[PDB]
Design a protein around this ligand. Structure first.
Ligand SMILES: CC(C)c1ccc([C@H](O)c2nc3ccccc3[nH]2)cc1
Length: 157
């Protein structure tokens, strides 16, 4: 059917995670840029239902979007668990210098570029080159680093 809640939860997923960042205390550093940057992907997603221009999507879209729904959940879920200092410490100590929302940016873009194609094919929603350009990904590695040094003060040896 076509209740609408599906899209409502799919779109809001980007806002909830963005605002949720404020809740963070340690990962807030990366979450700030993550939620802010990623928000750009949902920006054009909400504009659709907001403006009310693009007609109802078809199965071809439902399939693609359906993948982004669960995919994006990874981010909202990660930040949730990461909220706990134990989750950040155990992870930070587990390895040496690593990202927390790396795969997220990958899956989010991979799932977006897939559903964005069948979307732009008729009408280009976004503006910037969402396809080409993997700079935002490298930037993440730099953000996660800030959490490391910032974590030092969090707890003294
Ligand atoms: C952002 C725009 C493009 C959008 C809006 C809703 C959905 C939702 O997943 C959806 N509901 C549907 C009902 C009937 C047939 C297809 C549907 N897709 C997917 C994408």
């Amino acid at each position: 059917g076509s209740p609408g809640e599906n899209l409502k939860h799919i779109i809001t997923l980007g806002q909830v995670i963005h605002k949720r960042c404020e809740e963070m205390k340690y990962c807030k550093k990366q979450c700030r840029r993550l939620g802010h940057r990623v928000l750009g992907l949902i920006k054009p997603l909400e504009m659709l239902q907001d403006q009310g221009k693009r007609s109802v999507p078809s199965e071809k879209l439902t399939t693609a979007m359906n993948r982004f729904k669960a995919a994006l959940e990874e981010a909202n879920g990660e930040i949730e668990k990461f909220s706990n200092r134990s989750n950040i410490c155990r992870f930070l100590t587990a390895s040496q210098d690593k990202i927390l929302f790396k795969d997220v940016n990958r899956k989010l873009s991979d799932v977006w570029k897939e559903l964005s194609l069948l979307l732009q094919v008729e009408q280009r929603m976004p503006v910037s080159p969402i396809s080409q350009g993997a700079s935002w990904a490298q930037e993440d590695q730099q953000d996660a680093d800030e959490d490391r040094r910032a974590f030092q003060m969090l707890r003294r040896d």
